Amino acid sequence: AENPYERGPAPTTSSIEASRGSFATSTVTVSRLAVSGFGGGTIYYPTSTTAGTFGAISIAPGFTALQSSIAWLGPRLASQGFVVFTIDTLTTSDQPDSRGRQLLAALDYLTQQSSVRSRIDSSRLGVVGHAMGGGGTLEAARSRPSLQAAIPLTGWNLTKTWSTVRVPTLVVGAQADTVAPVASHSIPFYNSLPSSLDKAYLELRGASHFAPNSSNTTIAKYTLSWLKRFIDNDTRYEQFLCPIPSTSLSISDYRGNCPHNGXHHHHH
Ligand SMILES: [Cl-]
Ligand SMILES: [Cl-]
Ligand SMILES: [Cl-]
Ligand SMILES: [Cl-]
Ligand SMILES: [Cl-]
Ligand SMILES: [Cl-]
Ligand SMILES: [Cl-]
Ligand SMILES: [Mg+2]
């Protein structure tokens, strides 16, 4: 294809909302004892060897949480054409800066040492995270500007200013979140990102802090579209991001610049 990184069939509303994409997937377990730098995890990967190499992401949980809290993202994203590494942290009490470093240590294990490293294009990587792990994605993106995408889900971080981030970032907030309220976390994060950066804010209507821990089609479709657009440079997914979505039962607020790779809109 024109885009060497394009994978899978042309997307539709149905395909980006489905619980699975078109790629068969498998898993590998990485034990705590096999790695240094992070708490092990689970690799979800496309099994096909005829489609080319894939981009990859690491995903981190929040304070006290285990990888089971984010596991549903594994098959859901991997089956759309990504290697997805859901990790445990060294301790459940690790703070956002530590989670950020562990996201990066996990990506380096994935691309340099893991059993699927040959299936990955190590130049096309991203980070996703929930809660303090979402705070970790901003920490990781700030440190590693070569990342292609960063997605904090209901993120928590005492640092509110992210004006040096150069990684395209989708900030996902939960409107009713009382643990990491959007007014003091997600929205400040989004507002402090550079005006020149490809970025978006997605607010889940009436959602709690725990919405990212259960199957959620709105989180899935926009996470997928963002990862496709920026890890794969896949302009077939631009249609779902630009013009920005209108508010709905699932979406209470959306902000972002359009078009990508080139003005800011906001729907409330
Ligand atoms: Cl539609
Ligand atoms: Cl459709
Ligand atoms: Cl491995
Ligand atoms: Cl870098
Ligand atoms: Cl700050
Ligand atoms: Cl809450
Ligand atoms: Cl909708
Ligand atoms: Mg890119």
Short mmCIF file of C-alpha atoms and ligand atoms in Angstrom, two decimals:
data_model
loop_
_atom_site.label_atom_id
_atom_site.label_comp_id
_atom_site.label_asym_id
_atom_site.label_seq_id
_atom_site.Cartn_x
_atom_site.Cartn_y
_atom_site.Cartn_z
CA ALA A 1 0.00 0.00 0.00
CA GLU A 2 0.97 3.69 -0.33
CA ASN A 3 1.50 3.79 3.45
CA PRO A 4 4.06 1.08 4.33
CA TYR A 5 2.65 0.87 7.89
CA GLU A 6 -1.02 0.42 6.96
CA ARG A 7 -2.49 -2.79 8.39
CA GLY A 8 -5.91 -4.38 8.14
CA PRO A 9 -9.05 -3.56 6.19
CA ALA A 10 -10.46 -0.10 5.64
CA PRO A 11 -12.20 1.04 8.83
CA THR A 12 -15.87 1.63 9.42
CA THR A 13 -17.97 2.59 12.42
CA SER A 14 -18.63 -1.11 12.89
CA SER A 15 -14.99 -2.15 12.67
CA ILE A 16 -13.63 0.40 15.15
CA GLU A 17 -16.40 -0.37 17.69
CA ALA A 18 -16.09 -4.16 17.45
CA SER A 19 -14.68 -6.11 20.38
CA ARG A 20 -12.13 -7.60 17.96
CA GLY A 21 -10.42 -6.53 14.77
CA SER A 22 -9.51 -8.74 11.85
CA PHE A 23 -6.12 -10.04 13.08
CA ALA A 24 -5.82 -13.29 14.98
CA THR A 25 -3.99 -12.78 18.26
CA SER A 26 -2.12 -14.73 20.89
CA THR A 27 -0.47 -13.96 24.21
CA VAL A 28 2.84 -14.42 25.99
CA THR A 29 3.28 -14.10 29.77
CA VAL A 30 6.37 -12.25 30.99
CA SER A 31 7.07 -13.07 34.64
CA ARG A 32 8.33 -10.58 37.23
CA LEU A 33 11.49 -12.68 37.63
CA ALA A 34 12.39 -12.49 33.91
CA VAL A 35 12.68 -8.72 33.82
CA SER A 36 14.28 -5.82 35.68
CA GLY A 37 12.76 -2.33 35.44
CA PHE A 38 9.08 -3.24 35.65
CA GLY A 39 6.82 -5.95 37.21
CA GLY A 40 6.36 -8.23 34.22
CA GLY A 41 3.22 -8.36 32.14
CA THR A 42 1.27 -9.90 29.27
CA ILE A 43 2.07 -9.46 25.57
CA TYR A 44 -0.91 -9.54 23.20
CA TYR A 45 0.23 -9.78 19.58
CA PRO A 46 -1.07 -10.48 16.06
CA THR A 47 0.01 -13.95 15.02
CA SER A 48 0.19 -13.17 11.30
CA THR A 49 3.68 -13.05 9.83
CA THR A 50 2.58 -11.98 6.33
CA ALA A 51 1.30 -8.46 7.04
CA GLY A 52 4.64 -6.87 7.96
CA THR A 53 5.87 -5.65 11.32
CA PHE A 54 3.54 -3.85 13.73
CA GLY A 55 3.77 -0.86 16.01
CA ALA A 56 3.59 -1.53 19.74
CA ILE A 57 2.42 -0.04 23.02
CA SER A 58 2.89 -0.62 26.72
CA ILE A 59 -0.04 -0.03 29.06
CA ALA A 60 0.27 0.74 32.77
CA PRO A 61 -2.30 0.54 35.59
CA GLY A 62 -2.91 3.02 38.39
CA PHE A 63 -2.22 3.24 42.12
CA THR A 64 -2.63 -0.14 43.92
CA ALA A 65 -3.85 -1.69 40.66
CA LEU A 66 -2.83 -4.86 38.83
CA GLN A 67 -2.59 -5.43 35.10
CA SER A 68 -5.96 -7.20 35.22
CA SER A 69 -7.49 -3.73 35.55
CA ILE A 70 -6.39 -2.87 31.98
CA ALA A 71 -6.28 -6.33 30.40
CA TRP A 72 -9.40 -5.85 28.27
CA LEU A 73 -7.43 -3.41 26.10
CA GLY A 74 -5.00 -6.19 25.13
CA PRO A 75 -7.05 -8.32 22.74
CA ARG A 76 -9.24 -5.39 21.74
CA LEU A 77 -6.31 -3.34 20.40
CA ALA A 78 -3.94 -6.16 19.40
CA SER A 79 -6.56 -7.71 17.08
CA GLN A 80 -6.63 -4.41 15.17
CA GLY A 81 -2.90 -4.75 14.35
CA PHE A 82 -0.71 -3.83 17.33
CA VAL A 83 1.54 -5.52 19.84
CA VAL A 84 0.12 -4.61 23.25
CA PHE A 85 2.09 -5.11 26.52
CA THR A 86 -0.06 -4.76 29.66
CA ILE A 87 2.36 -4.46 32.57
CA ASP A 88 2.45 -4.79 36.33
CA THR A 89 4.55 -2.24 38.18
CA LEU A 90 7.45 -3.01 40.51
CA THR A 91 5.21 -2.15 43.46
CA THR A 92 1.53 -1.28 43.55
CA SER A 93 2.38 2.02 45.31
CA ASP A 94 4.65 3.37 42.55
CA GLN A 95 4.10 7.05 41.71
CA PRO A 96 3.60 8.57 38.23
CA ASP A 97 7.29 9.29 37.54
CA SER A 98 8.16 5.65 38.38
CA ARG A 99 5.25 4.34 36.22
CA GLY A 100 6.55 6.46 33.32
CA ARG A 101 10.00 4.91 33.53
CA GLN A 102 8.43 1.41 33.73
CA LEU A 103 6.37 2.07 30.61
CA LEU A 104 9.65 2.85 28.83
CA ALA A 105 11.51 -0.09 30.36
CA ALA A 106 8.69 -2.35 29.17
CA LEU A 107 8.91 -1.02 25.62
CA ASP A 108 12.67 -1.60 25.61
CA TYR A 109 12.19 -5.18 26.81
CA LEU A 110 9.50 -5.69 24.17
CA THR A 111 11.64 -4.47 21.27
CA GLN A 112 15.10 -5.61 22.40
CA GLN A 113 14.63 -8.88 24.30
CA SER A 114 11.10 -10.30 24.13
CA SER A 115 9.95 -13.37 22.21
CA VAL A 116 8.00 -11.20 19.72
CA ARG A 117 10.64 -8.52 19.10
CA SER A 118 10.95 -9.52 15.41
CA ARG A 119 7.23 -8.76 14.90
CA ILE A 120 7.65 -5.12 16.00
CA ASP A 121 8.83 -1.97 14.23
CA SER A 122 10.84 -0.52 17.10
CA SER A 123 10.60 3.01 15.61
CA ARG A 124 6.77 3.08 16.03
CA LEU A 125 5.83 2.88 19.71
CA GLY A 126 3.30 4.37 22.08
CA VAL A 127 2.19 4.42 25.71
CA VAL A 128 -1.26 4.13 27.30
CA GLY A 129 -2.09 4.24 30.99
CA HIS A 130 -4.84 4.47 33.60
CA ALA A 131 -4.92 6.86 36.56
CA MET A 132 -1.43 7.25 38.02
CA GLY A 133 -0.36 5.14 35.03
CA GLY A 134 -1.91 7.80 32.83
CA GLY A 135 0.19 10.31 34.72
CA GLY A 136 2.98 7.93 33.80
CA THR A 137 2.27 8.22 30.07
CA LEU A 138 2.88 11.97 30.22
CA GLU A 139 6.09 11.41 32.16
CA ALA A 140 7.23 8.87 29.56
CA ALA A 141 6.24 11.03 26.60
CA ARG A 142 8.10 14.02 28.06
CA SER A 143 11.25 11.89 28.45
CA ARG A 144 11.04 10.00 25.13
CA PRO A 145 9.90 12.39 22.36
CA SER A 146 10.44 9.64 19.78
CA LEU A 147 7.21 7.97 20.96
CA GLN A 148 4.48 8.19 18.34
CA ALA A 149 1.47 8.47 20.68
CA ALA A 150 0.55 8.89 24.34
CA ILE A 151 -2.88 8.24 25.84
CA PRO A 152 -3.59 9.00 29.53
CA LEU A 153 -6.91 7.49 30.62
CA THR A 154 -8.38 9.41 33.59
CA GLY A 155 -4.84 10.36 34.48
CA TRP A 156 -3.54 11.51 37.86
CA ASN A 157 -0.41 13.65 38.18
CA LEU A 158 0.61 16.44 40.56
CA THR A 159 2.48 18.00 37.62
CA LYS A 160 -0.10 19.96 35.62
CA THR A 161 2.13 21.54 32.95
CA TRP A 162 3.26 19.47 29.95
CA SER A 163 4.42 22.22 27.62
CA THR A 164 7.50 20.32 26.37
CA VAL A 165 5.66 17.18 25.23
CA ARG A 166 6.14 16.54 21.50
CA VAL A 167 4.23 13.22 21.28
CA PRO A 168 0.65 13.30 19.83
CA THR A 169 -1.54 12.90 22.90
CA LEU A 170 -5.16 11.91 23.41
CA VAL A 171 -6.29 12.85 26.95
CA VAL A 172 -9.30 10.81 28.08
CA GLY A 173 -11.22 12.13 31.07
CA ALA A 174 -14.18 10.81 33.05
CA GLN A 175 -16.71 13.55 33.66
CA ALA A 176 -17.80 12.38 37.13
CA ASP A 177 -14.31 11.29 38.28
CA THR A 178 -13.81 12.18 41.94
CA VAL A 179 -10.35 10.58 42.28
CA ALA A 180 -8.58 12.31 39.38
CA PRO A 181 -11.11 15.07 38.63
CA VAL A 182 -10.93 16.35 35.06
CA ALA A 183 -10.95 19.95 36.31
CA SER A 184 -7.66 19.51 38.19
CA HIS A 185 -5.97 16.75 36.14
CA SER A 186 -7.07 15.82 32.60
CA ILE A 187 -8.18 19.28 31.46
CA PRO A 188 -5.10 21.10 32.84
CA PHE A 189 -2.96 18.46 31.13
CA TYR A 190 -4.66 19.03 27.78
CA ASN A 191 -4.58 22.82 28.10
CA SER A 192 -0.85 22.87 28.84
CA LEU A 193 0.15 20.80 25.81
CA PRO A 194 1.75 22.86 23.03
CA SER A 195 -0.62 24.55 20.61
CA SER A 196 1.36 23.05 17.72
CA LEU A 197 0.93 19.46 18.94
CA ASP A 198 -1.58 17.03 17.49
CA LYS A 199 -3.81 16.53 20.52
CA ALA A 200 -7.34 15.78 21.64
CA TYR A 201 -9.43 15.69 24.81
CA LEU A 202 -12.23 13.12 25.11
CA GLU A 203 -14.55 13.37 28.12
CA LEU A 204 -16.73 10.38 28.98
CA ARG A 205 -20.16 11.54 30.09
CA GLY A 206 -21.12 10.65 33.66
CA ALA A 207 -18.20 8.24 33.88
CA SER A 208 -16.37 7.36 37.08
CA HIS A 209 -12.66 6.90 37.70
CA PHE A 210 -13.19 3.17 37.05
CA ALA A 211 -14.67 3.42 33.54
CA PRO A 212 -11.32 2.43 31.92
CA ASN A 213 -11.27 -0.86 33.88
CA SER A 214 -14.24 -2.43 32.05
CA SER A 215 -14.96 -2.90 28.34
CA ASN A 216 -15.83 0.56 26.99
CA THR A 217 -16.53 1.03 23.30
CA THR A 218 -15.93 4.78 23.35
CA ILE A 219 -12.49 4.42 24.94
CA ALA A 220 -11.75 1.58 22.51
CA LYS A 221 -12.77 3.31 19.28
CA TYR A 222 -10.90 6.54 19.99
CA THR A 223 -7.82 4.84 21.46
CA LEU A 224 -7.70 2.64 18.37
CA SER A 225 -8.19 5.56 16.01
CA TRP A 226 -5.48 7.62 17.72
CA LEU A 227 -3.00 4.74 17.69
CA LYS A 228 -3.77 3.97 14.05
CA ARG A 229 -3.46 7.62 13.05
CA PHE A 230 -0.12 8.21 14.78
CA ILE A 231 1.68 4.87 15.30
CA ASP A 232 0.75 3.72 11.78
CA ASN A 233 0.42 7.14 10.14
CA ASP A 234 -2.92 5.65 8.96
CA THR A 235 -4.95 8.48 7.43
CA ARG A 236 -7.87 6.08 6.91
CA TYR A 237 -8.64 6.68 10.62
CA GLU A 238 -8.49 10.49 10.36
CA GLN A 239 -12.21 10.46 9.47
CA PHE A 240 -13.10 9.38 13.01
CA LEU A 241 -11.01 12.12 14.65
CA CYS A 242 -11.56 15.12 12.31
CA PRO A 243 -13.91 16.98 12.27
CA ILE A 244 -14.09 16.40 16.02
CA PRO A 245 -16.97 14.25 17.28
CA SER A 246 -20.11 15.90 18.55
CA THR A 247 -21.32 15.33 22.09
CA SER A 248 -23.53 12.31 22.71
CA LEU A 249 -24.70 9.98 25.47
CA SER A 250 -21.11 8.73 25.73
CA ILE A 251 -19.21 11.98 25.02
CA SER A 252 -19.75 15.05 27.22
CA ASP A 253 -16.85 17.08 25.80
CA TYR A 254 -14.37 16.78 22.94
CA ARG A 255 -11.54 19.15 22.03
CA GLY A 256 -8.85 18.88 19.43
CA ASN A 257 -7.02 20.35 16.46
CA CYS A 258 -8.00 19.46 12.91
CA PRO A 259 -6.65 18.46 10.49
CA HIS A 260 -3.70 16.47 11.81
CA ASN A 261 -0.14 16.76 10.47
CA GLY A 262 -1.00 20.32 9.37
CA UNK A 263 -7.19 25.08 14.20
CA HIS A 264 -8.68 24.03 17.59
CA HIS A 265 -12.36 23.10 18.11
CA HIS A 266 -14.31 22.22 21.27
CA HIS A 267 -17.81 20.63 21.55
CA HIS A 268 -19.62 20.91 24.94
CL CL B 1 -21.82 6.31 12.54
CL CL B 2 -20.54 0.63 9.73
CL CL B 3 8.94 -12.59 26.11
CL CL B 4 13.55 9.62 22.35
CL CL B 5 2.80 22.14 37.23
CL CL B 6 -15.02 8.34 40.69
CL CL B 7 -21.10 8.76 20.14
MG MG B 8 3.78 8.79 13.24
#
